[PDB]
């Protein structure tokens, strides 16, 4: 249980609340993150944060390290931020953010308009780059995956929306 | 940029083309390199050239050692290497011929002594389909 044993090492400006099995983290530049704990973890509080198990079961050992990682994401998510870079490849492919609506042109008859949910915000520095700014990983990653699923990449020419940290296989037509 | 000029391109610019793949600059100003450098080894040696765009258009020519492909082709036989190396000899080479260009190519080669320096060209001539003998 290497992950569970490791303390969280929270930064300077972070407010911690602990109502037993209910936890909430307050941070500057984005706040209001909270989650509930399963009944088999003890969170001792100090200048740091550390996680321990209650039972000696297999599932308790596995879930002790999951609760540590979830809290670490919350702590970073309020102090720092989470962003996931996307880029478009192809001809005529362009994106444009107009408030809370992100319009994409991905080679269909109609242009797709995607409604960014509350919380995260997207911004387009250029016509072929999308940023998904947010404070939690699950909502940022889920939205970036929904947008990417409109026109996923092709092997023969590589066209389509792709993760900026993604490797795309390529092939050629025979002969 | 690491283009390889060929004995002069002041007037002609078929292979010079210092505008495609790099920020296009003055061609008339840059093409005068063939005059100041004046090649050095006949009007046949293709020499390496390195230029910098600098701030806006400030040209700067460095000129490196001649490539070790024309010396191994235009000085010891046919100027074209064999299609299949190490399978059909292109032309015999003596140890003195390699040592003739070894001192001229004093740039880099990371050689502490001339004993090791010859071994660098030996692997180069083998890849060309030539035959090297001591």
């Amino acid at each position: 249980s290497r992950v569970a044993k490791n303390p969280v090492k929270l930064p300077a400006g972070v407010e911690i609340k602990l109502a037993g099995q209910q936890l909430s983290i307050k941070g500057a530049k984005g706040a209001l993150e909270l989650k509930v704990h399963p009944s088999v973890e003890v969170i001792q509080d100090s200048g740091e944060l550390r996680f321990a198990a209650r039972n000696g079961d297999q599932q308790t050992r596995a879930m002790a390290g999951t609760t540590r990682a979830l809290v670490n994401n919350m702590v970073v998510g309020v102090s720092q931020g989470f962003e996931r870079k996307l880029q478009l490849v192809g001809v005529g492919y362009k994106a444009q953010a107009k408030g809370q609506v992100l319009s994409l042109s991905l080679g269909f008859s109609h242009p797709v308009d995607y409604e960014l949910p509350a919380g995260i915000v997207a911004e387009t520095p250029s016509q072929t780059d999308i940023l998904i700014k947010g404070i939690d990983k699950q909502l940022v990653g889920q939205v970036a995956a929904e947008i990417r699923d409109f026109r996923p990449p092709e092997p023969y020419k590589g066209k389509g929306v792709r993760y900026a940290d993604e490797v795309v296989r390529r092939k050629e037509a025979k002969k | 940029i690491k283009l390889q000029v060929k004995a002069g391109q002041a007037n002609p610019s078929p292979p010079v083309g210092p505008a495609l793949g790099q920020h296009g600059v003055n061609i008339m100003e840059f093409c005068k390199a063939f005059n100041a450098k004046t090649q050095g080894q006949e009007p046949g040696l293709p020499t390496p050239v390195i230029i910098t765009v600098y701030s806006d258009r400030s040209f700067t020519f460095e000129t490196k050692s001649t490539p070790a492909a024309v010396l191994l082709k235009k000085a010891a036989g046919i100027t074209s290497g064999s299609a299949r190396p190490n399978s059909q000899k292109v032309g015999t080479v003596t140890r003195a011929q390699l040592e003739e260009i070894a001192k001229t190519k004093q740039a880099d080669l990371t050689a502490a002594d001339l004993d090791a320096a010859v071994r660098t060209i030996a692997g180069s001539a083998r890849s060309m389909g030539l035959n090297v003998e001591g």
Partner: protein, 168 residues
């Protein structure tokens, strides 16, 4: 004006267009870039020893970007009027009619050849552009006069056929 087909089965025909043109207009689409047939066309033009003026077409499309064409054509040794300056480039829109007047200005500006025709009073001399057989009036030959003047009722010798012109 001579209009030639663009497919690869008509290369000989394209050659026949090169030996009579005195100027080549190379049309290349801005989106599609340089393709095999435009390379073959510039090969024909070089073999003919003739000046080349291009017209980067379909510029009205949002894609456009008539810049990679410059590099591609420079690779085949067709220097733009900029850079060094051998042949003039010009963007046109064909079906919007933007830049067509400038293209015409560029092509008629090629008076550096001086286009001297010798006398128009010489005996006619020309080349056959095409030929066909008509069921009502026999062999019909579409010929481009090169110099001299061709008049009705004149003895003509073309290829191995000869004869005199009933009609023109």
């Amino acid at each position: 004006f001579l209009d030639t087909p663009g497919h690869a089965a008509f290369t000989a025909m394209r050659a026949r267009g090169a030996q009579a043109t005195d100027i080549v207009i190379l049309v290349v689409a801005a989106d599609d870039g340089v393709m095999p047939q435009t390379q073959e066309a510039v090969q024909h033009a070089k073999a003919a020893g003739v000046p080349i003026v291009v017209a980067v077409n379909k510029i009205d499309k949002p894609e456009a970007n008539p810049d990679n064409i410059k590099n591609g054509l420079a690779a085949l040794d067709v220097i733009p009027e900029e850079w060094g300056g051998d042949a003039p480039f010009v963007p046109v829109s064909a079906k919007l009619g933007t830049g067509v007047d400038e293209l015409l200005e560029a092509v008629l500006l090629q008076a550096e050849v001086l286009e001297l025709k010798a006398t128009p009073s010489a005996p006619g001399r020309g080349v056959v552009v095409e030929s066909r057989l008509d069921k009502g009036r026999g062999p019909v030959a579409t010929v481009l006069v090169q110099d001299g003047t061709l008049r009705q009722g004149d003895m003509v010798l073309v290829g191995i056929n000869y004869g005199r012109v009933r009609a023109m």
